[PDB]
Ligand binder design. Structure first.
Ligand code: A1A0P
Ligand code: A1A0P
Ligand code: A1A0P
Ligand code: A1A0P
Ligand code: A1A0P
Ligand code: A1A0P
Ligand code: A1A0P
Ligand code: A1A0P
Ligand code: A1A0P
Ligand code: A1A0P
Ligand code: A1A0P
Ligand code: A1A0P
Ligand code: A1A0P
Ligand code: CU
Ligand code: CU
Ligand code: CU
Ligand code: CU
Ligand code: CU
Lengths: 241, 239, 382, 96, 153, 77
């Protein structure tokens, strides 16, 4: 036999558990980080890109992709409810490593100007909803609604001190706006930032809630599609050519 | 009666990547400012184009030698593989997967966002920026080599993977490889299509799409676990 | 850095930066340097570059080695993107504050949406001191003075660490048990319902409720701490005041313009008519940040980057006082290694071999007229 | 290979057509003069999708970059059209 | 104006067009402004008669390299030669395999599981030679074209 | 109705309507009311509003309670 005793089998299984956790975690880090940055990283890099319309709308929709697939695999095959949490934690770890060692360690951009957005509450909501309900349709709908809606309230304690108005050289500016102005991004001019500028159809203080609800609806859709995407990605098929 | 898991090999697999990439980061910090800013200058030549040529030649040589050695020493007769030796080979393949995951993290996560930083702080001048040299032409080939080696080892040593070509393994291994040709699109994206240094531009969706193929790892993992369990470990563990 | 690789004709035909000044060449940490000058938008704007309806005045440097304290276009602060008109000249001023020590090549640039970067002449500036001495004080409308280098850093660290710790605890609660193989076998065997207990359900409910309640309380506390907040200020600022400059009493027609392809020079036949302003003489030809000067007529005293300054790179067949009214056809030869160093000789690879530049005419009293010339450039191979 | 060999294979044919000419004071190509002289009434000059130069165009890398991008997209299109043809090769019979 | 131009609304412009007669006959000639995103704007047409033979038409052009060429027949033979050469190579590649039974026996052999018998070592060597010769010929032709015309724009 | 909810700066920075007159305050059915005035286009037009290359002069009311008999901009229908 491969193993000589039950205790040896348990120890071998624990070693395999640790090694497979390492493999899954860091492959997820690589893939999720590349997808997340090349989908929404301009808003995540700079504090003056963290607006109420585009950041709040875009970030959860594109970030709900990997958690859906990883949940569809882990909960179905192992009853492990931490897929969304592990995806968010890996993305945050990679982003923070890059910000501290490259954004600040190399180009000396201040950390308070280059910090990532908080994402743990949405992953926790998704994971808990999936674990308690046990059905992927209800998880999709309700958990994606929560994931979309909790993104901006979760990040508000961080960005709130950066929105104190300042009279800078005769013009009204935000602290994040002054941060973007002072610290020169040679490759990132001011016109590139996709932030809300006001529309003639913009109503009475409804920008952030409308963006959050739109993000939640699109998160429902993207979760529903990426659940089946991950189901396909979990196939155990062998080819002969 | 060697131990089932070779701790020395796992330690080497982690440490070689860690040390090499730390030295690469030190080199980027030291020479990325004095020589990497201007591309039409001699110091830029001798400090980055030589690096590119040497890394390309070494990558080709290493990939050829490693893949040929793995394919040459394949187990011709796998029917006589004892369950204990099969478990040891499974642990070695898991070490290979650990190395592949570490290389994937170093390439797709660290240096890609470092490249984003570099492009947001300076004006792009050439396709062979020091950031591009380190990211596209050093880390990506390294993780491609590691993935190909892991796939070849699994196919040539594990009876579970020797009965055919594993589709999830093939997707997980070749998918990220397609990130390397897609760099051309990236160049065609920056020189002709998009005039702005926007990291969310569609010209980068190619990367994204092939990054999705890394998710195939989950399927591969399942197969790996079965390769770990079909040898009698699962029966003893279920007791 | 980054201009030598840009197409020569694109550099010749977009924006021209004329008289520029730098307040200091060597600065200490926290000291300010002022870069002033004029920029002219070429009338024959290239079609592949969008019109500068949305343009941003930027500083080209390898990072935040300086901080841009302020920027003015026509005397008006321009923290946002602006709108520029084709064929108009604008004053610009940029005040920067030194942050990091070292020698830095600083350029003034105009980023144009749908066009890309337009880099101007770069100057080497030395910063002496320690980066730890740099301070960025800002006074808010609420009566608080803060330092932007470290403001809100601890709060961000605390919140990110708190949420990361919560996620790690959630994972580690399940990580105390067998993870992958036994659970997979149990699920395959049909014993999945045994893998989650009532205590696990209660823990998940507590985690969800605590997460929601903590988010709500944190938002309320942040609102209480900062009751006055404004959204990010953005928009394109129109109505930039251009310069009202004297029209050139000097008329210049380009008969022919040629460059030898091996080549480090450019030659042009010009017909010049003086419409008054006393006998005049050509003193300088500006092409792409490169200034070819006629030492006998004009001498630069502004510390123009020497790599871009050819003190005797202008050779005019007859540069004698052009009596008001005289129409002389002259052969001008602009020669300098900068032509090859700044890759202006790479116009041979350009899909449009046409050049544009500025000619500067000086009278006996020193009054200067600026004439704007554009023509096709023909390579010579024989 | 299919993407990369396209332009080197055609270069011997179009190379004599790229000799510079000083046509009426403007620099022109022989192919450009061919297009100018022989009037295409239904094909004005602005329709031709040809490179005109960009501010992000670098130092003599247009053709290789185009070739590599074409090769990558050729990989993608070949992969998709292989299965398209596999579907087109089905021997199926319908009853309605 | 050999290229597209920019016109302003409400302005008047002089225009001149010099044409050279090429083919005999009566031709209705119009001056037109093609506008991008608009279409054709045709002006008054005039009937012009061309007398002579088309064989007498010449289009001399002097290049910056010192060569005078006729655009009617310039580079025609080179294009014919290269296209015929590559077409002949493709035809030879097809005809090498076309000397054997093509469709039915090969289909039956593949269905029967004897596909490996349809390609021999000599066929593999021929394919390798074809690939190597194609690549080498392309490279040599590019080098020769570059040597013949060192000045291109 | 509908202006109070529009952004204050957008209302301040688009079009200015100066001296206006209404011919009548109370009208009978089939009677006509004339509204004349001047409107100035602000030079600093907001970037999120497209330039008025395509603009329509409209009457804001809760429906066809009136019928717009005619409209003139600069004396031209
Ligand atoms: C991530 C993108 C997904 C790609 C699409 C999924 C693969 C194709 C599936 C259907 C056809 C093959 C059969 C089932 C799969 C697995 C597979 O390819 O198995 C081998 C089969 C032959 O096996 P069989 O026993 O004769 O019966 C068919 C198996 N169901 O090959 C084929 O059928 C043809 C070749 C397979 C396709 C190429 C490999 C796909 C991997 C991705 C390529 C790289 C592109 C991404 C780079 C960024
Ligand atoms: C075997 C170790 C465990 C396995 C995991 C790897 C952990 C290793 C960390 C290395 C720490 C030393 C870094 C200092 C380099 C030490 C180093 O290389 O210093 C020189 C450069 C600076 O050189 P220069 O540019 O010429 O200087 C002018 C401007 N500074 O700094 C750096 O490189 C420091 C910043 C970057 C350091 C990398 C971050 C650490 C890597 C973490 C990997 C993620 C692992 C995840 C595990 C949870
Ligand atoms: C080139 C475009 C491809 C079109 C899609 C492929 C055809 C459809 C396949 C699935 C449904 C039918 C069953 C399998 C096919 C072949 C087919 O149509 O068979 C007859 C079946 C009835 O047969 P059965 O024994 O009862 O069981 C189903 C057979 N698999 O009809 C149907 O199922 C419905 C009608 C078939 C569809 C119409 C004809 C399609 C030809 C193209 C139409 C023209 C459009 C192109 C013009 C430019
Ligand atoms: C559902 C369980 C019951 C708990 C209460 C539910 C949410 C709260 C209140 C309900 C009353 C509705 C009025 C809202 C308070 C209304 C409210 O507080 O509105 C605040 C602002 C308005 O700001 P203002 O003008 O300065 O204020 C004066 C308003 N006359 O509007 C918004 O935030 C806009 C609403 C947010 C956008 C969502 C609209 C809903 C779209 C439908 C899909 C979402 C629903 C999910 C379906 C399952
Ligand atoms: C729709 C389902 C009902 C339950 C959720 C309640 C619905 C209403 C709002 C929640 C969306 C996020 C807040 C933005 C709204 C839209 C909204 O009200 O926006 C105004 C401000 C943002 O304004 P600003 O200009 O950026 O200035 C900052 C001032 N705070 O947010 C709020 O006032 C926050 C409102 C509520 C915050 C608590 C969130 C908790 C509820 C969401 C999670 C639900 C998940 C349930 C799990 C099963
Ligand atoms: C944004 C919209 C949501 C995303 C779309 C996906 C959501 C869920 C379902 C829709 C499509 C996937 C369902 C799986 C196919 C459906 C599926 O699961 O398998 C079909 C078969 C399986 O292969 P087989 O065993 O050889 O064939 C015999 C049938 N079992 O695929 C094939 O035959 C080949 C085609 C499979 C291609 C599916 C790839 C999934 C897409 C990955 C790309 C990334 C995601 C893109 C969306 C952004
Ligand atoms: C000094 C640090 C610790 C020891 C170093 C060895 C590695 C660490 C731990 C495991 C082995 C410890 C004891 C080993 C003693 C001896 C020793 O060095 O063994 C390792 C291999 C032998 O591999 P093995 O026969 O499979 O058996 C290993 C099990 N003991 O040595 C070799 O000489 C290498 C084997 C031949 C394959 C060479 C690969 C191709 C090389 C070209 C470059 C490839 C590409 C480069 C990157 C681009
Ligand atoms: C298969 C892969 C497809 C891509 C999916 C992943 C996301 C990638 C890119 C788009 C993310 C948005 C951020 C921009 C980065 C991608 C990027 O670079 O976008 C640039 C534009 C702004 O510049 P531009 O001059 O407009 O250029 C157009 C090029 N897309 O951003 C935009 O988002 C605006 C473009 C229009 C697209 C709007 C976003 C989509 C709105 C929702 C509908 C789509 C369906 C949603 C699911 C229900
Ligand atoms: C970064 C900070 C880290 C925070 C760490 C939080 C601790 C997390 C988890 C504790 C796990 C204990 C599980 C015990 C069940 C262990 C368990 O299941 O014990 C049997 C009890 C029997 O209880 P009983 O009395 O017979 O019935 C209930 C009424 N008496 O069953 C249960 O259902 C017990 C449920 C207890 C669950 C406690 C978990 C709550 C954790 C919330 C944490 C809040 C976050 C921090 C706030 C700042
Ligand atoms: C692969 C086997 C080894 C054989 C050599 C491989 C190809 C040749 C050289 C390798 C050294 C790299 C530097 C190139 C010479 C570099 C070289 O010759 O560049 C010429 C021009 C530059 O022209 P210039 O500025 O006037 O010249 C001065 C440059 N400082 O650039 C180009 O042509 C751009 C490069 C072509 C675009 C492809 C980039 C690669 C993208 C990655 C995907 C493709 C790779 C496939 C993956 C499998
Ligand atoms: C990438 C895989 C490695 C093998 C191929 C070598 C990679 C580099 C270049 C080849 C791409 C085409 C040439 C344009 C490059 C990009 C490149 O170098 O472009 C510059 C000129 C074109 O410039 P121009 O402004 O139009 O002026 C004409 C001057 N020649 O092309 C070249 O210099 C040609 C370079 C190489 C030509 C030989 C092609 C043979 C290799 C391709 C086939 C590979 C297939 C292998 C079969 C398995
Ligand atoms: C540009 C992107 C690449 C092109 C896409 C195609 C590449 C390869 C695979 C993707 C889709 C085709 C795979 C075949 C379906 C997958 C396939 O091969 O058959 C599915 C079944 C076969 O018919 P059946 O026997 O009746 O059904 C029972 C299952 N055998 O089709 C259906 O049921 C009907 C749908 C089939 C439609 C496929 C048509 C193929 C597309 C032709 C359009 C032209 C190409 C467009 C792309 C530009
Ligand atoms: C438009 C111009 C048309 C060009 C026509 C080119 C001719 C094409 C094919 C010839 C087929 C002969 C096959 C003989 C195998 C017939 C064959 O297989 O014979 C058995 C030999 C035995 O040879 P051996 O000596 O025992 O072993 C090798 C070393 N001695 O096996 C082989 O493997 C022989 C391989 C010979 C293959 C020759 C084909 C090369 C064709 C290249 C053409 C170049 C293009 C033209 C350049 C301008
Ligand atoms: Cu890119
Ligand atoms: Cu510079
Ligand atoms: Cu000008
Ligand atoms: Cu009203
Ligand atoms: Cu007004």
């Amino acid at each position: 036999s491969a193993v000589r005793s039950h205790a040896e089998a348990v120890q071998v299984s624990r070693t395999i558990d640790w090694m497979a956790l390492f493999v899954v975690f860091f492959v997820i880090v690589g893939s999720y980080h590349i997808h997340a940055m090349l989908t929404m990283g301009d808003w995540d890099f700079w504090s003056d890109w963290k607006d109420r319309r585009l950041w709040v709308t875009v970030t959860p929709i594109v970030l709900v992709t990997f958690p859906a697939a990883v949940q569809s695999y882990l909960w179905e095959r192992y009853r492990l409810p931490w897929g969304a949490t592990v995806c968010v934690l890996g993305l945050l770890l990679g982003e923070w490593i890059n910000r501290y060692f490259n954004f600040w360690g190399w180009t000396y951009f201040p950390i308070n100007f280059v910090f990532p957005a908080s994402l743990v509450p949405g992953a926790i909501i998704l994971d808990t909803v999936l674990m308690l309900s046990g059905s992927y349709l209800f998880t999709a709908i309700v958990g994606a609604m929560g994931w979309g809606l909790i993104f901006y309230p979760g990040n508000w304690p961080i960005i709130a001190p950066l929105h104190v108005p300042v009279e800078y050289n005769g013009m009204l500016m935000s602290i994040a706006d002054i941060q973007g102005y002072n610290y020169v991004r040679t490759g990132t001019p001011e016109y590139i930032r996709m932030v809300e500028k006001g529309t003639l159809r913009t109503f009475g203080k409804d920008v952030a809630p409308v963006s959050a609800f739109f993000s939640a609806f699109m998160s429902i859709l993207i979760y529903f599609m990426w659940h089946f995407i991950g189901r396909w990605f979990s196939n155990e098929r062998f080819l002969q050519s | 009666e060697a131990p089932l898991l070779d701790k020395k090999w796992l330690t080497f697999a982690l440490a070689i990547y860690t040390v090499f990439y730390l030295w690469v980061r030190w080199y980027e910090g030291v020479y990325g400012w004095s020589a990497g800013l201007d591309s039409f200058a001699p110091e830029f030549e001798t400090y980055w184009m030589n690096f590119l040529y040497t890394e390309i030649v070494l990558e080709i040589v290493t990939a050829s030698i490693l893949w040929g050695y793995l394919w040459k020493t394949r187990d011709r007769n796998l029917a006589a593989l004892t369950p204990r030796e099969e478990l040891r080979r499974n642990f070695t393949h898991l070490v290979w997967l650990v190395a592949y995951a570490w290389a994937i993290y170093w390439g797709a996560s660290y240096f890609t966002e470092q490249d984003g930083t570099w492009h947001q702080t300076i004006v792009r001048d050439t396709d062979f920026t020091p950031s591009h040299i380190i990211e596209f032409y050093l880390s990506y080939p390294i993780y491609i080599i590691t993935g190909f080696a892991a796939f070849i080892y699994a196919k040539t040593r594990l009876p579970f993977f020797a009965k055919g070509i594993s589709l999830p393994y093939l997707v997980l291994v070749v998918g990220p490889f397609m990130i390397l040709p897609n760099v051309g699109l990236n160049e065609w994206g920056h020189t002709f299509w998009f005039m702005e240094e926007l990291f969310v531009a569609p010209l980068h969706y190619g990367f994204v799409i092939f990054g999705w193929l890394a998710l195939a790892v989950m399927g591969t993992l399942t197969q790996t676990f079965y390769s770990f369990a079909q040898g009698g470990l699962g029966q003893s563990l279920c007791e | 850095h980054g201009e030598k690789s840009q197409a020569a004709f694109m550099r010749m035909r977009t924006i021209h930066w004329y008289d520029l000044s730098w307040s200091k060449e060597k600065v200490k940490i926290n000291e300010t340097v002022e870069i002033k000058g004029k920029f002219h938008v070429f009338e024959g704007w290239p079609e592949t570059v969008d019109e500068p309806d949305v343009a941003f005045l930027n500083v080209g440097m390898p990072g935040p080695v300086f901080i841009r304290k302020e920027s003015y276009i026509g005397g008006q602060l321009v923290p946002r993107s602006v709108r520029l008109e084709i064929g108009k000249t604008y004053d610009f001023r940029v005040v920067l504050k030194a942050r990091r020590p070292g020698d830095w090549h600083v350029h003034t640039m105009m980023n144009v949406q749908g066009g890309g970067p337009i880099i101007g002449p770069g100057k080497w500036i030395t910063v002496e001191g320690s980066m730890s001495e740099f301070r960025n004080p800002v006074t808010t409308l609420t009566g608080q003075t803060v330092d932007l280098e470290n403001y809100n850093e601890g709060n961000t660290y605390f919140w990110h660490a708190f949420w990361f710790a919560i996620g790690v605890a959630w994972i580690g609660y399940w990580s105390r048990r067998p993870i992958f193989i036994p659970r997979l076998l149990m699920v395959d065997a049909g014993r999945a319902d045994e893998l989650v207990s009532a205590t696990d359900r209660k823990v998940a409910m507590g985690f969800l409720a605590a997460t929601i309640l903590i988010v709500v309380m944190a938002m309320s506390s942040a609102n209480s701490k900062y009751p006055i907040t404004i959204p990010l200020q953005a928009g394109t600022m129109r109505g930039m005041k251009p310069l009202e400059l004297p029209a050139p009493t000097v008329s210049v027609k380009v008969e022919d313009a040629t460059y030898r392809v091996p080549g480090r020079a450019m030659r042009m036949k010009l017909t010049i008519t003086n419409h008054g302003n006393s006998p005049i003489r050509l003193g300088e030809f500006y092409t792409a940040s490169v200034r070819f000067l006629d030492s006998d007529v004009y001498k630069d005293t502004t510390g123009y980057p020497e790599d871009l300054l050819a003190e005797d790179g202008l050779s005019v067949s007859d540069n004698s006082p052009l009596a008001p009214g005289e129409t002389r056809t002259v052969d001008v030869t602009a020669s300098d290694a900068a032509w090859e160093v700044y890759r202006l000789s790479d116009i041979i690879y350009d899909p449009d071999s046409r050049f544009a530049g500025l000619l500067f005419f000086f009278d006996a009293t020193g009054n200067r007229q600026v004439v704007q010339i554009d023509a096709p450039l023909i390579p010579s191979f024989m």
